[PDB]
């Protein structure tokens, strides 16, 4: 159609069509003129409201600097179509599905709407398989159910990225299937890095023989709000293809899905609604929900999204990160105080769950020890404030044992990374289930009551903790 | 002519409400009758909402407005390198006009993902506590944090000074600082000839708000000039906190929905669309780079405050300074315990790593036992050696302001304590040692100091030739 | 000009002129009729907005009770002019520069606008001279740079006034130059007191031979908001004369500049803007800034403003007081807990800085000891919570020494006042640099490890602490 721009207040455009033309909600519009002497069509917007009076509101996916009132807008006749399929792997995409990797145009078969209805209730599954990661805290205290949606929480700078990397190292590189990494509201470096690294490891096309098993979609910090509120949906429209069309088992690595919400808070008040708890939009739960139940495992295939979430000011109560939890078969809440101790990955052994923490899906040895380990971690934690002032001299010989052992647990629960070889300074170690399960069993048994604490700190296996 | 001209409707609080001006573009300067400049941000249904740029006391409801048609351009060139520039790039140091050839935008897109390469190139700050445990590399964004009077500005002061000629171009951007304080600084850079390569984009507290936003943006552009031109830059934005505050004022005065601490809905795109304009372009663009050391004042060590929270999740490392650890001898005070560096040691040479890295392991262990010393009624030597070699390296990390050590003077000095030389000595003296020994090596042995740099690492020879040096040198205390 | 009142909502008037007449922003207006049967012109306002529709808004500097719509307003043709110069000394002024001291009209040479552009960047200076005050904590842990702007912070009732008095006693009475005291939002008593005291000490004219070296401008609590938001600017328009016109070194004693901001918060929402962090105006930083860089030392002379600031609810985070800090070459944050201990002046030896705390401007003996003193004050402070529960029995003989010495420091850092001779009950003592520097040196050396704590409490010099 052909409407005219009427108001440009920041990333929000109030286009005006005739009483006949009325772009549907979520149907994308496109404006014709913009930057410093030159005519480009980069200015794409998404209809989100019919203000009435022959006028729709919309948020642009591109910067609206240079735009003018009167400029012609056009109704594409549907929503924003991202090209999907195999011809996406090894490339880098825009929020608008445009190659940003400078390797020629994208030769796709078909495009695809970022706005699709989640699977029907009868297209779901209940199979619960494990996902051995290699971290002495994940697979033992909070596993990963395949098809499941993992929540990796933590505050500003705690290790979530380094965490999403060792997962791409321990699981994606070797994964027998395709993967996808969504660039939702983060550092550009964290893009170039992941790129040049995934290049050397050969995940990307060393040569265009096209053996790649990964597809990237980057919408970093600098981008406007109406971009990172959606690059998640581009990274996912491409994932909602490999899952049901090629019946593959895909991985969806979203580095921070909070930035998806943050950017959502920014268009809200800017659109004309009324803020909610902690300045967040009234539509906080309708937005991070519709795009978190498409990120899932259906009978047609699977989607095992290892997602990360930013926690504003270390507060879990905060609406944005708290909202995520419900959509997770596990969690991994990283601490800043436990990070201030040098224990990495800074994972609170107490605050990190997983539905598959059941003897009916993993084992009793895996089950018991898991709890046994946390029991003491509850003990010492409840003994801290006590001994920190009441000393130890009057503590029973049956309780001073909890201390030593726990401190040997809290330290054996420390493991360097193949990516963090620059923060630890020691060679990394992949620690699967069995090696972890037994190692701790030998701890909870007091068969190592002689070994010092710093013997379990930054060690691979229990043997490497007796060495 | 309600196409290119228009009338002013209301001039309230540094903001204007132009009527007409159908053609205006979002981000386009407009001119007033009394010759006042202004940007355009609210192209509302029938009235333009312009944010003035200066004393709006002049504009009169009825006066007309012309459309510059220009989108906030700022002159740029080599011509600056030593001129305390303004907010719109116009001298405030009275040395005449600035010869500008080309001119770039205040606001512009930042280097993508391909146009970049990881940080390998080092960046010496002249600080033993930074370039040895908090490695900053060219192109990387490194944030400086601290409460009031927390030696932050000093960190920046030394750093830029510590820059050898033809090595890095610097841009000092003061936002919200005092005219006087900027003078005390703009002066201490001259007497050490450091201002022959540094620009001073500064906007005092008295300046109108609508500039204290563009201050960093200004200093950004002028710095980008050197980036694309295969040259490296270092930008220090004094208090982004102050710019964030300034931003709140425009939205409110522009009647835009606020939120946490009144900060509007775009307090994250003031810094994310600023600090991201800093990077290390790939060799297919010129290898040029730019390093940003932004400053953000905390309130009572409250690092989780909103603005301090955002910035930290935009930067690649921190150098927290402490209000409690000043007077306790730690001058400058570097909380090397919480101070990080995402780029990693990758922003260091080999000579430094061989010592600094080992120094990382040491000063990281002492951190676990530090509280014990004052209550060490009977500890083991395996632990005593730590509380021994601990407070020794500290006094080495201590530095008198204004004196940035060279890399040679850096590695050499650390070699002393890190290898057991300054061990059995007394702490309340150590500082004097280094001061004497450094000059002693600079005077009598400048021959080895040059062997160190050129080789960029200590040979099996220089080591023993240093062993003979320091040992016999501690032997003159 | 001649406009008519249109709206009177509290201290805010919405005058209406014709489409031709448009009082400039900040240009003062004056209304013609008001109080109980009688016609006075006291009603003076300041234009602050051009609401549009042929209408300016304004805040009155006088109470608007009795005012009516239709009343004629007039555009003086410039801003509020306060009479300045030598014929101001020994008198008491209004916010409108009217004598409120009942000693005849003010015979000035010329008036002067309270709205003037700060000094240009090339009219500044970098000379750093000390300002020995006589307090065992100021000149040693946080000096005063001449030309500098001192920040004296503290919460409701801590000693800031008593502090601004001993400064007028220790420095103003003997100052070789003129001084000024701004009455910004405080008690009337604190005016009458300072007056009858400065009278007896002869700072004021005992006889009109005019030997005075002080000029007062009082706008106390009771006054409306649009008064104390400006008496600071009258006290300062008179100071911006002695500084550059008579090339003198002046002092600007502002008793609470917070009241300048508080009163500013009150016209804000009342004018029609949108509140900010902690209810404060959006223009919080544009208002306390423009009038804090005129309060300064230029090459033409000097201004050493010893300013005080109110801290709402003991909170430093608060926007209003926190904003001040940036504009200070020193600070003196008074504590309420350290005041609840009987130590006066209640000055936190840890929280009170000064740029001149450098060996390059004062000395090593002054520098070292300063830190040495604070080191222990950091030690004991970090030993409090510890010993308060862990006792002392296990404390090293090398740490129990920190306690005693510190407690002797924290007490030697207590000094009575020549003004507070009613709160302490002991005769005051002026303690300059040298006497202070040495006295503490004899402490940090353990040459007084025998002397009890209460021997340094409320004492003049170290000798008076051995007596």
Swiss-Prot record, chains A, C:
Domain of life: Eukaryota
GO terms, molecular function: ATP binding; ATP hydrolysis activity; proton-transporting ATP synthase activity, rotational mechanism
Record flagged with keyword Hydrolase: no
Enzyme class: translocase
Main location: plastid
SUPFAM superfamilies the UniProt entry points to: C-terminal domain of alpha and beta subunits of F1 ATP synthase (SSF47917), N-terminal domain of alpha and beta subunits of F1 ATP synthase (SSF50615), P-loop containing nucleoside triphosphate hydrolases (SSF52540)
Binding site for ATP: 154-161
Cellular compartments per GO CC: chloroplast thylakoid membrane; mitochondrion; proton-transporting ATP synthase complex
InterPro entries: AAA+_ATPase, ATP-synt_VA_C, ATP_synth_F1_bsu, ATPase_a/bsu_AS, ATPase_alpha/beta_chains, ATPase_F1/V1/A1_a/bsu_N, ATPase_F1/V1/A1_a/bsu_N_sf, ATPase_F1/V1/A1_a/bsu_nucl-bd
Membrane topology: Peripheral membrane protein
Subcellular location: Plastid, Chloroplast thylakoid membrane
GO BP annotation list: proton motive force-driven mitochondrial ATP synthesis
Reactions listed under catalytic activity: ATP + H2O + 4 H(+)(in) = ADP + phosphate + 5 H(+)(out)
Keywords in alphabetical order: ATP synthesis, ATP-binding, CF(1), Chloroplast, Hydrogen ion transport, Ion transport, Membrane, Nucleotide-binding, Plastid, Thylakoid, Translocase, Transport
EC number: 7.1.2.2
PROSITE patterns found in the cross-reference section: ATPASE_ALPHA_BETA
Pfam families associated with the record: ATP-synt_ab, ATP-synt_ab_N, ATP-synt_VA_C
Family assignment from sequence similarity: Belongs to the ATPase alpha/beta chains family.
HAMAP family listed in its UniProt record: ATP_synth_beta_bact
Protein task: Produces ATP from ADP in the presence of a proton gradient across the membrane. The catalytic sites are hosted primarily by the beta subunits.
Subunit text: F-type ATPases have 2 components, CF(1) - the catalytic core - and CF(0) - the membrane proton channel. CF(1) has five subunits: alpha(3), beta(3), gamma(1), delta(1), epsilon(1). CF(0) has four main subunits: a(1), b(1), b'(1) and c(9-12).
Protein name according to UniProt: ATP synthase subunit beta, chloroplastic
From Swiss-Prot, chain B:
Pfam families to which the protein is assigned, alphabetical: ATP-synt_ab (PF00006), ATP-synt_ab_C (PF00306), ATP-synt_ab_N (PF02874)
MF term (GO), any: ADP binding
Annotated keywords: ATP synthesis, ATP-binding, CF(1), Chloroplast, Hydrogen ion transport, Ion transport, Membrane, Nucleotide-binding, Plastid, Thylakoid, Translocase, Transport
Residues under site feature: Required for activity: 339
SUPFAM superfamilies in the record: C-terminal domain of alpha and beta subunits of F1 ATP synthase, N-terminal domain of alpha and beta subunits of F1 ATP synthase, P-loop containing nucleoside triphosphate hydrolases
UniProt topology in membrane: Peripheral membrane protein
Primary site of residence: plastid
Enzyme class: translocase
Keyword Hydrolase in record: no
Subcellular location: Plastid, Chloroplast thylakoid membrane
GO cellular component, one term: chloroplast thylakoid membrane
EC number(s) recorded for this UniProt protein: 7.1.2.2
Reactions accelerated catalytically: ATP + H2O + 4 H(+)(in) = ADP + phosphate + 5 H(+)(out)
Residues that coordinate or bind ATP: 146-153
GO BP terms in the entry: proton motive force-driven ATP synthesis
NCBIfam families named in the record: atpA (TIGR00962), PRK13343.1 (NF009884)
Role this protein plays: Produces ATP from ADP in the presence of a proton gradient across the membrane. The alpha chain is a regulatory subunit.
HAMAP family the UniProt entry points to: ATP_synth_alpha_bact (MF_01346)
Family label: Belongs to the ATPase alpha/beta chains family.
Subunit structure: F-type ATPases have 2 components, CF(1) - the catalytic core - and CF(0) - the membrane proton channel. CF(1) has five subunits: alpha(3), beta(3), gamma(1), delta(1), epsilon(1). CF(0) has four main subunits: a, b, b' and c.
Name of the molecule in the record: ATP synthase subunit alpha, chloroplastic
């Amino acid at each position: 159609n052909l409407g005219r721009i009427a108001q440009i207040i920041g990333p929000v455009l109030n286009v005006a069509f005739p009483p006949g033309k009325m772009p549907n909600i979520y149907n994308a519009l496109i404006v014709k003129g913009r930057d410093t002497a030159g005519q480009p069509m980069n200015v794409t917007c998404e209809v989100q409201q019919l203000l009435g009076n022959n006028r729709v509101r919309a948020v642009a996916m591109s910067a609206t600097d240079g735009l003018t009132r009167g400029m012609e807008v056009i109704d594409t006749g549907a929503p924003l179509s991202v090209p999907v399929g195999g011809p996406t792997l090894g490339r880098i995409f825009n929020v608008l599905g445009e190659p940003v990797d400078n390797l020629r145009p994208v030769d796709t078969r078909t495009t695809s709407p970022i706005h699709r209805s989640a699977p029907a209730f009868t297209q779901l599954d209940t199979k619960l398989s494990i996902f051995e990661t290699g971290i002495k805290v994940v697979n033992l205290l909070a596993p990963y159910r395949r098809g499941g949606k993992i929540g990796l929480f933590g505050g500003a700078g705690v290790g979530k990225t380094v965490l999403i990397m060792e997962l791409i190292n321990n699981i994606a590189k070797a994964h027998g299937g395709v993967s996808v990494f969504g660039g939702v509201g983060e550092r550009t470096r964290e893009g170039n890095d992941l790129y040049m690294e995934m290049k050397e490891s050969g995940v990307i096309n060393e040569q265009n023989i096209a053996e790649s098993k990964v597809a990237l979609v980057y919408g970093q910090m600098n981008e406007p709000p109406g971009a990172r509120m959606r690059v998640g949906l581009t990274a996912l429209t491409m994932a909602e293809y490999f899952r049901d069309v090629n019946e593959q088992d895909v991985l969806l690595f979203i580095d921070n899905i909070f930035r998806f919400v943050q950017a959502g808070s920014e268009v809200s008040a800017l659109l004309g609604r009324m803020p909610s708890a902690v300045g967040y939009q009234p539509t906080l739960s309708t937005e991070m929900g519709s795009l978190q139940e498409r990120i899932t495992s259906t009978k047609e295939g699977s989607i095992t999204s290892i997602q990360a979430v930013y926690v504003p000011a270390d507060d879990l109560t905060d609406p944005a990160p708290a909202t995520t939890f419900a959509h997770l078969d596990a969690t991994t809440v990283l601490s800043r105080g436990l990070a201030a101790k040098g224990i990495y990955p800074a994972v609170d052994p107490l605050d990190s769950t997983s539905t598959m923490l059941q003897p009916r899906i993993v084992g009793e040895e895996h089950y018991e020890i898991a709890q046994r380990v946390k029991e003491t971690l509850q003990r010492y934690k409840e003994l801290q404030d006590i001994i920190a002032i009441l000393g130890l001299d009057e503590l029973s010989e049956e309780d001073r044992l909890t201390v030593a052992r726990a401190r040997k647990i809290e330290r054996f629960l420390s493991q360097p990374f193949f990516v963090a070889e620059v923060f630890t300074g020691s060679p990394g170690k992949y620690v699967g289930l069995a090696e972890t399960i037994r190692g701790f069993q030998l701890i909870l048994s007091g068969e190592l009551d002689s070994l010092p604490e710093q013997a379990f700190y930054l060690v691979g296996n229990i043997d490497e903790a007796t060495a | 002519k309600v196409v290119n001209t228009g009338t002013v409707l209301q001039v309230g609080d540094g903001i204007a409400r132009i009527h007409g001006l159908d053609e205006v573009m979002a981000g386009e300067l407009v001119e007033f009758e009394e010759g006042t400049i202004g940007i355009a941000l609210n192209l509302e249904s029938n009235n333009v909402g312009v944010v003035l740029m200066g004393d709006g006391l002049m504009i009169q409801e009825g006066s007309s407005v012309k459309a510059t048609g220009r989108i906030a351009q700022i002159p740029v060139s080599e011509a600056y390198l030593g001129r305390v520039i303004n907010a719109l790039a116009k001298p405030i140091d009275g040395r005449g006009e600035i010869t500008a050839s080309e001119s770039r935008l205040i606001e512009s897109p930042a280097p993508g993902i391909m146009s970049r390469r990881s940080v390998y190139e080092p960046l010496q700050t002249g600080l033993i506590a930074i370039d040895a445990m908090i490695p900053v590399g060219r192109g990387q964004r490194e944030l400086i944090i601290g409460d009031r009077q927390t030696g932050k500005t000093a960190v920046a002061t030394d750093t830029i000074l510590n820059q050898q000629g033809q090595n890095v171009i610097c841009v000092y951007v003061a936002i919200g600082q005092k005219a006087s304080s900027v003078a005390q600084v703009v002066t201490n850079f001259q007497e050490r000839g450091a201002m022959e390569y540094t620009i001073v984009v500064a906007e005092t507290a008295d300046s109108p708000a609508t500039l204290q936003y563009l201050a960093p943006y200004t200093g950004a552009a002028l710095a980008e000039y050197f980036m694309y031109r295969e040259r490296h830059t270092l930008i220090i934005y004094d208090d982004l906190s102050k710019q964030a505050q300034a931003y709140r004022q425009m939205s409110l005065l522009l009647r835009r929905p606020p939120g946490r601490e009144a900060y509007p809905g775009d307090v994250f795109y003031l810094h994310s669309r600023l600090l991201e304009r800093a990077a290390k372009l790939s060799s297919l663009l010129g290898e040029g780079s730019m390093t940003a050391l932004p400053i953000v004042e905390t309130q009572a060590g409250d690092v989780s405050a909103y603005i301090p929270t955002n910035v930290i999740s935009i930067t690649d490392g921190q150098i927290f300074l402490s209000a409690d650890l000043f007077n306790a001898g730690i001058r400058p005070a570097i909380n090397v315990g919480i101070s990080v560096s995402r780029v990693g040691s990758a922003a260091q040479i080999k000579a430094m790593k061989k010592v600094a890295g080992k120094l990382k392991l040491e000063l990281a262990q002492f951190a676990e036992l530090e509280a014990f010393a004052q209550f060490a009624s009977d500890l083991d030597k395996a632990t005593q050696n730590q509380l021994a070699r601990g407070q020794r390296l500290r006094e080495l990390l201590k530095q008198p302001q204004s004196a940035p050590l060279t890399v040679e003077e850096q590695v050499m000095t650390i070699y002393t304590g890190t290898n057991g030389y300054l061990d059995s000595l007394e702490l309340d003296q150590v500082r004097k040692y280094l001061v004497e020994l450094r000059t002693y090596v600079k005077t009598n042995k400048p021959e080895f100091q040059e062997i160190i740099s050129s080789t960029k690492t200590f040979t099996e020879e220089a080591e023993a030739l240093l062993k003979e040096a320091i040992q016999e040198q501690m032997e003159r205390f």
